[PDB]
Amino acid sequence: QRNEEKAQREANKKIEKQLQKDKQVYRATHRLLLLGADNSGKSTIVKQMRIFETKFQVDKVNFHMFDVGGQRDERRKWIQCFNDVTAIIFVVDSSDYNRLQEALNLFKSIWNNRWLRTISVILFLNKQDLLAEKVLAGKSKIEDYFPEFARYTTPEDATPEPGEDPRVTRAKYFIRDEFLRISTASGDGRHYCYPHFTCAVDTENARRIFNDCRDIIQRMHLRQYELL
Amino acid sequence: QVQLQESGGGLVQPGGSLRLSCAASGFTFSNYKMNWVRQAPGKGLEWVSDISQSGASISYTGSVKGRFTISRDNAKNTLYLQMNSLKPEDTAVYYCARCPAPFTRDCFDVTSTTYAYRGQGTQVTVSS
Amino acid sequence: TDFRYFIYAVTYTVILVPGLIGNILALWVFYGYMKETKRAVIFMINLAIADLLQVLSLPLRIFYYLNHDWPFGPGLCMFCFYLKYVNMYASIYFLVCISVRRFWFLMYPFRFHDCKQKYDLYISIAGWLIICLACVLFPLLRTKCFVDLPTRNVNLAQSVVMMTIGELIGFVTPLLIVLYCTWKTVLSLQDKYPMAQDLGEKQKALKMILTCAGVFLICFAPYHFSFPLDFLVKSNEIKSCLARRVILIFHSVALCLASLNSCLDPVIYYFSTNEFRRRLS
Amino acid sequence: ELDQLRQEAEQLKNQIRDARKACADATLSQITNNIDPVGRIQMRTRRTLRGHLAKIYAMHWGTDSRLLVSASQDGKLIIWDSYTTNKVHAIPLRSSWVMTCAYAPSGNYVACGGLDNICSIYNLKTREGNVRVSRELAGHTGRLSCCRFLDDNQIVTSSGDTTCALWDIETGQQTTTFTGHTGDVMSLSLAPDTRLFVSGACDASAKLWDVREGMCRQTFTGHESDINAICFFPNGNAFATGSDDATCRLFDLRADQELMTYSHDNIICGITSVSFSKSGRLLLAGYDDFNCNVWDALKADRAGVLAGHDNRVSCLGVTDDGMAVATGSWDSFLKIWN
Amino acid sequence: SIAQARKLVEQLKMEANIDRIKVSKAAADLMAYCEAHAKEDPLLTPVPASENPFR
Ligand SMILES: CCCCCCCCCCCCCCC(O)OC[C@@H](O)COP(=O)(O)OC[C@H](N)C(=O)O
Ligand SMILES: CC(C)CCC[C@@H](C)[C@H]1CC[C@H]2[C@@H]3CC=C4C[C@@H](O)CC[C@]4(C)[C@H]3CC[C@]12C
Ligand SMILES: CC(C)CCC[C@@H](C)[C@H]1CC[C@H]2[C@@H]3CC=C4C[C@@H](O)CC[C@]4(C)[C@H]3CC[C@]12C
């Protein structure tokens, strides 16, 4: 009776000690959900940041990102699983105009999901070099796939790279604004989208993810500890 | 059983007109966002149009925007796609895709191999 | 005491009702926040309690200043004299604690988490005790209910040393800590590189932080500048009649400002918050 | 031949529907209208088993009706003693994303699985003290959504690759493959005799399978959206399924059609977990609205509400002895009711 | 896709070839099971707290 109950209590004490240690380790790392499609350099982002999971560390903060690629095309049930992550890192190839609508639909589905309406999305418009080549060549027209691009003017807050053709900047910010329209249509202020223009040879995406996650955590702290 | 039957389609010269009708059975039509999804030969599924529960929020793919019209008749439990100003690039098998869950603004229904709640589809060929 | 009565009476009458209403409503919303949310609001609970205790200290002062006589006995009068100062310094302490916590979870977010809010109750009662013991000094030096009591005849050197120590700690340490934390928090909330285009909450929080430090610095600075001068005047160290009169008037205005802060902490700290504006609605 | 096969399938479906309608002489609700309702059911949180760091997806009561095992997204499989609220075991998992857990009838083994596509069997009764990963079962190409032990050597696992698998643990290879679902299989329940089992899938259809034959014995199509929960009636001749269209539905194996629908106008959130009481009179369902419901399985009238969770209720369990009902939610809490 | 259609037709034939019973009989069996075991259901009938290991 009591003899076995004392042993059970001691075992529970050891379990809770190990569980507190695991809680300290667990809360100190941030989970990111990597999403994208084929021909989008999510794998290139992972490898340039040094499979299913990749671990990186910036400013003594540990992130580990999950690239779920072992399942079928349907996403509903295993996207329900990634609702506690700090950020969803959505990588989209800006060059491919054919799949831009598919990526917009996927972004809208992620944004409007009941269990993903709180996670902020870090949007990486990858493959900007190929998009610039397509825009400069002129063989492929964005207005063919997006007619409203024919009525689009570059935003006044745009920050083009020095020595860049304004057509390329217009295309970049058009795609970014298409994603941000979905972002702000039903954001409700609870989550936000953080667009970035990245390329294959970019070597600073980890810092962008770090800053975006720090902003997300600051906003979360502001939201929760309003009464302190 | 969730059944979606598509009617219409066929061979049409470029610039013609078509009406794709979609009879839905086995579920409450008014509670689900509906989609029209086409698969062109030699390529995978492509989302064409969608319309919300009450028909207030319709949205279109930019390729077919300005030519195709999407509508619902929740009384008759039917989905309409008025296809106007057809092009040779618009030849495809057309499908009705019901969004997986009711009262949701998100949809995952362009599954390349098998989607649970997609119709059989009808061929729409545009050539001379 | 003439002018002072008029001044203290009107200011305390103006402050009593808003302090009561705001602080009791804030405590009710705290109980609601506990029943609805598992988070802890210990620091703001202590701040509201201290402000409410100050407000409940006012009415007997109002009665004395209106009637010029004290029929309730010396013990109650001395306790009421002790109350206002003890919970005023409690308010200062918990404003500092709130500022430090906001600095912690807005300047080092990751490090913050939420189990990093674990020794809060000890931080709260450590304060409510040290203050009450430091404020044991208040009745002893003034051993006629609130303003007409003669100060204890004590040596100028020891009095000056003790007064400097008390002023230094209980004002400079809160002031320096609050100013530094507000500066760092404002620096953190300001996005230099472009970030997500929010609805404006990162700027509303900036305005709230700046408004708090400011009300602190203006309700509490004049009191602690005029406090050594008032103590010197009441100890007869200063002999200039005009200087004594202006010092007394300035000290009266300064305590008026301090009680005004006691009744203004509700508004700024609580009713500007979205959670209050949603719970009442 | 494709058109001929489609026409033949349509005719077969039509005549199956006609036969089922012919068998539908009367409704279950009409026959059960005479009996008096159970009235309000009062249930309360006896134990609040806490210690999980993240959401719980699956739990499973032991046959001893005292020990339970829960799986959490933090990569932890905690075996609690419900009576004393003492965590008997806490197994770390190689894959943090675990969506299923099972506890063997013998009590010597537990099962784990999820996005790793692998069913990890852990041996609790180890000579060398702490638990160790007994074996790993691979061969499924979609996440593992639910696991159920036939015995200490056979386990039936449903996967999001539209299949189920009967594994012999000793050999480690997939003994039998059950195929025919056209969507992710999200739940399965074993019959009391462990001879048949019903699996609910994302194609809004449940399937009754025979474990020895390996072929689909029956298919039930009465729902509108994905099926997330399923469980046999205690007699084994019926089963209730929960779906995303905020409806629970009761099917009978011999009747081969839906018998009764448990739904309300005020309920729009989808089901996540269903279970029956020991007698089967009460059907307990978990919802997305953070609260569990307790329906009268015979009269389709709600009899109770278990509102004690601050997040989505993800797993339900009923003791074999019938003492208690455990609800595990996404607020990292598992609670006991009776 | 011919194999998928053939398999679906075969499965439909198998599901059709079975023998069904009346829904009245199924309802009667469910009622009989519910009433026979109603005594041994602590959820259905709250057992006194002295017999609850949790209370
Ligand atoms: C924990 C840190 C504590 C910080 C320091 C606290 C103790 C500091 C005490 C040092 C000297 C105290 C001198 C006592 C003294 O002079 O009384 C305080 C004065 O403000 C009295 O105010 P008085 O001008 O008489 O008017 C009274 C006023 N109407 C009233 O309502 O209190
Ligand atoms: C006249 C003066 C001395 C009264 C002093 C009262 C002080 C010591 C008492 C009164 C109210 C008490 C507080 C009441 C409320 C709370 C919030 C609770 O979550 C933690 C305890 C805490 C923080 C108490 C701390 C001690 C406390 C502040
Ligand atoms: C009126 C006077 C006495 C107020 C005194 C203010 C200063 C001395 C007090 C008030 C609030 C206190 C802080 C409250 C919060 C913390 C977090 C704790 O984990 C470490 C100590 C620390 C940093 C305390 C340091 C001392 C502190 C800053």
CATH code at position E32: 4.10.260.10
Quick one: how far is CA D155 from the chain centroid? 15
Dihedral, CA of residue C80, residue C83, residue C85 and residue C89, to nearest 10: -170
- In contact, D161 and D181? CB cutoff 8 Å: no
d(CA D170, CA D172): 5
> What's the number of CA atoms in the CB half-sphere (13 Å) around residue A85?
25
CB burial of A162-187 (b: ≥16 within 10 Å; e: otherwise) equals eeeeeebbbbbbbbbbbbbebbbeeb
Q: Is A108 on the interface with B (CB under 8 A)?
A: yes
Contacts of C190 (CB under 8 A, 6+ apart): C206
* Resolution, Å (one decimal): 2.8
Q: Is D7 on the interface with B (CB under 8 A)?
A: no
**Nearest-by-Cβ selection for D226 from B31, B100, B114:** B100
Q: Which two tokens stand for residue C202?
A: 């990162």
C130 CA closest ligand 1 atom index: 1
- In contact, C33 and C41? CB cutoff 8 Å: yes
Give the SS3 label for residue D100.
Answer: strand
CATH of the domain at A168: 3.40.50.300
Q: Which domain holds residue E45?
A: 1-55
CATH of the domain at C39: 1.20.1070.10
CB burial of D205-218 (b: ≥16 within 10 Å; e: otherwise) equals bbbbbebeeeebbb
Which of D210, D245, D233 shows the shortest CA–CA distance to D282?
Answer: D233
**Which residue type, as a one-letter code, is found at position D57?**
Y
d(CA D14, CA B56): 36
Count: domains in chain A: 1
Note every long-range contact of B20-23, with CB atoms under 8 Å and residues 24 or more positions apart, other chains counting: B20/B80, B20/B81, B20/B83, B20/B94, B20/B122, B20/B124, B21/B78, B21/B79, B21/B80, B22/B78, B22/B79, B22/B80, B22/B81, B22/B96, B22/B119, B23/B77, B23/B78
d(CA A155, CA A159): 9
* Pocket (CB within 6 angstroms of ligand 3): C 89, 92-93, 96-97, 100, 119, 123, 170, 173-174, 177
Give the SS3 label for residue A150.
Answer: helix
The sign one gets for the Cα dihedral D176, D179, D185, D191 is negative
d(CA D312, CA D62): 24
Interchain contact, A27 vs C115, CB within 8 Å: yes
Contacts of D280 (CB under 8 A, 6+ apart): D233, D234, D235, D297, E30, E33, E34, E37
Q: Which two tokens stand for residue B128?
A: 């001379």
- In contact, D209 and D240? CB cutoff 8 Å: no
Residue spans of alpha helices (H) in chain A: 2-27, 42-48, 76-79, 100-112, 128-137, 142-145, 166-185, 205-224
Instruction: Determine the Cα angle at A153 with ends A152 and A157, to 5°.
Output: 130
Distance from CA of C44 to the nearest CA of A (A): 6
Q: What share of chain C is helix, strand, coil (3-state, %, to 5)?
A: 80, 0, 20
DSSP at C218: H
Count: domains in chain E: 1
C-alpha R_g of chain C: 20
Ligand number, closest to the Cα atom of C100: 3
d(CA C276, CA C36): 13
Contacts of B2 (CB under 8 A, 6+ apart): B25, B26, B27, B98, B116, B117, D204, D224, D225
DSSP at D83: T
For chain B, which residues make up each domain, given as ranges? Answer: 1-128
Query: How many other C-beta atoms are found inside a 10 Å radius of the C-beta of residue A73?
Result: 13
d(CA D298, CA D35): 9
Query: Measuring CA to CA, how many Å separate C192 from each of A157, A205, C65?
Result: 14, 18, 54
Which H/E stretch holds residue D174? Answer: strand D174-179
Q: Which domain holds residue C93?
A: 2-279
For chain D, which residues make up each domain, given as ranges? Answer: 45-337
Touching chains, A (3+ CB pairs < 8 A):
B, C, D
Ligand 3 atom 15 nearest Cα: C97
Size (chain C), residues? 281
C136 close to ligand 2 (CB < 6 Angstrom)? no
Distance from CA of B40 to the nearest CA of A (A): 13
Full DSSP string of B79-95 = EEEEEES--GGG-EEEE
Sheet of D144-149: strand order equals D144-149, D154-159, D163-168, D174-179
Q: Is C150 on the interface with A (CB under 8 A)?
A: no
Query: How many other C-beta atoms are found inside a 10 Å radius of the C-beta of residue D11?
Result: 12
Beta-sheet pairing, D67-72 with D76-81: antiparallel
- In contact, D73 and D58? CB cutoff 8 Å: no
- In contact, B122 and B9? CB cutoff 8 Å: yes
* Mutate-to-test residue for ligand 3 from C105, C172, C173, highest number of ligand atoms within 8 A of CB: C173
Distance from CA of D218 to the nearest CA of E (A): 6
d(CA C84, CA E53): 54
Judged on CB neighbours under 10 Å (0-12, 13-18, 19+), C157 is: exposed
* Pocket (CB within 6 angstroms of ligand 1): C 8, 61, 81, 84, 89, 130-131, 134-135, 137-138, 141-142, 146-147, 163, 166, 169-170, 230-231, 251, 255
Q: Which two tokens stand for residue C206?
A: 């900036």
Q: In terms of CATH, what superfamily is D45-337?
A: YVTN repeat-like/Quinoprotein amine dehydrogenase (2.130.10.10)
Count: domains in chain C: 1
Touching chains, C (3+ CB pairs < 8 A):
A
For D71, list phi and psi in degrees, rounded to 5: -115, 130
Q: Which two tokens stand for residue B115?
A: 């989607």
Give the SS3 label for residue C45.
Answer: helix
Interchain contact, B62 vs A147, CB within 8 Å: yes
C8 CA closest ligand 1 atom index: 29
What residue has token string 């307790």?
A: D294
Question: What are the chain A neighbours of B107 within 8 Å (beta carbons)?
Answer: 105, 109
